[PDB]
């Protein structure tokens, strides 16, 4: 209705919505709205643009939803793939390994734990091939970037590529 009206831009509507009502609920909703087939894909096409414009929400978006949902999202919209990987890659690079408990951990509490990050990557890798090669290559390039070790305790990216086979 706002698109046909053309008075004010969707970004304004979405921004106003985002402040008023409960955010986590709104985000869950968005995920599912991103997947509904057209009923006339201008609906989804507007939301992808709004989201890539506003990073903070997408920061809390990819943080709040489950894995498989985001996997289906990304295979649907290739425009969402590279940024989401950047988000995950950034969470990897801000972990540190401790030798006493055999587990990668973050310093701060709100840094995604090992388990959640493993989950998301496993979901992303168990997907159609258009995304499998993309995520796999984005991971290998971040491994080689941090020293090409072949043994755990040195590179989060080695531990991911191992915990996949």
């Amino acid at each position: 209705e706002v698109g046909k009206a053309e008075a004010e831009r969707p970004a304004r509507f979405l921004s106003s919505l985002w402040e008023r009502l409960p955010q986590n609920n709104f985000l869950k909703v968005i995920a599912v709205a991103l997947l509904q087939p057209p009923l006339s894909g201008e609906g989804s096409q507007v939301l992808v643009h709004w989201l890539l414009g506003n990073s903070e929400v997408f920061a809390a978006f990819c943080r709040a939803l489950p894995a498989g949902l985001l996997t289906l999202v990304t295979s649907r919209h290739p425009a969402l793939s590279p940024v989401y990987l950047g988000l995950l890659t950034d969470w990897g690079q801000r972990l540190h390994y401790d030798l006493q408990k055999g587990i990668w951990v973050g310093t701060e509490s709100q840094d995604v734990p090992w388990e959640e990050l493993h989950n998301r990557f496993q979901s992303l890798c168990q997907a159609p091939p258009p995304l499998k090669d993309k995520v796999l290559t984005a991971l290998e390039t971040c491994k080689a970037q941090d020293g090409d070790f072949e043994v755990p305790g040195l590179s989060i990216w080695t531990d991911l590529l191992l915990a996949l086979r």
């Binding site: 055999g102 587990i103 755990p152 191992l162 915990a163």
Partner: protein, 150 residues
């Protein structure tokens, strides 16, 4: 000790009661406890490594392992007694000695031969994926440590 090794390289019961029959077999505290050629070539090499003559210590340890593992045909030469080192600690001390001698390319063929012969003992490192409970003797860890410093 150097002399003693060459000495020990060389190896009648009368129908009468003599002293030897009455003398006791000696203990470890005795000064008359003298092991075999091999347990003493290991004493020499241990004291040589303890002192800091590592070039020489390397030669002795390669002569020790030559005795123990080139033992098929002749009279047997035993490994060091139990209160001493077990046989993997003899290979490790051998590697340490050759490292200090500046012969690191040999201390890798040593450690690799030790992990080759005992592969079947070593754990399969499937716990590597699952990561206190499982078992590995120290001498295996220690070999990776030395294979590193090499």
């Amino acid at each position: 000790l150097e002399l003693l090794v060459e000495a020990l390289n060389v190896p009648a019961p009368q129908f009468l009661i003599e002293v030897e029959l009455l003398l006791p077999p000696p203990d470890l505290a005795s000064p008359l406890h003298c092991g075999t050629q091999s347990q003493t070539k290991h004493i020499l090499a241990s004291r040589c490594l303890q002192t800091g003559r590592a070039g020489d210590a390397a030669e002795h340890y390669l002569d020790l392992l030559a005795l123990l593992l080139d033992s098929s045909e002749p009279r047997f030469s035993p490994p060091p007694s139990p209160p001493g080192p077990c046989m993997p600690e003899v290979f490790l001390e051998a590697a340490v000695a050759l490292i200090q001698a500046g012969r690191a390319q040999d201390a890798l063929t040593l450690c690799e031969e030790l992990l080759s012969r005992t592969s079947s003992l070593l754990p399969k490192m499937s716990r590597l994926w699952e990561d206190e409970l499982p078992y590995c003797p120290l001498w295996v860890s220690a070999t990776h440590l030395l294979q590193g410093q090499a």
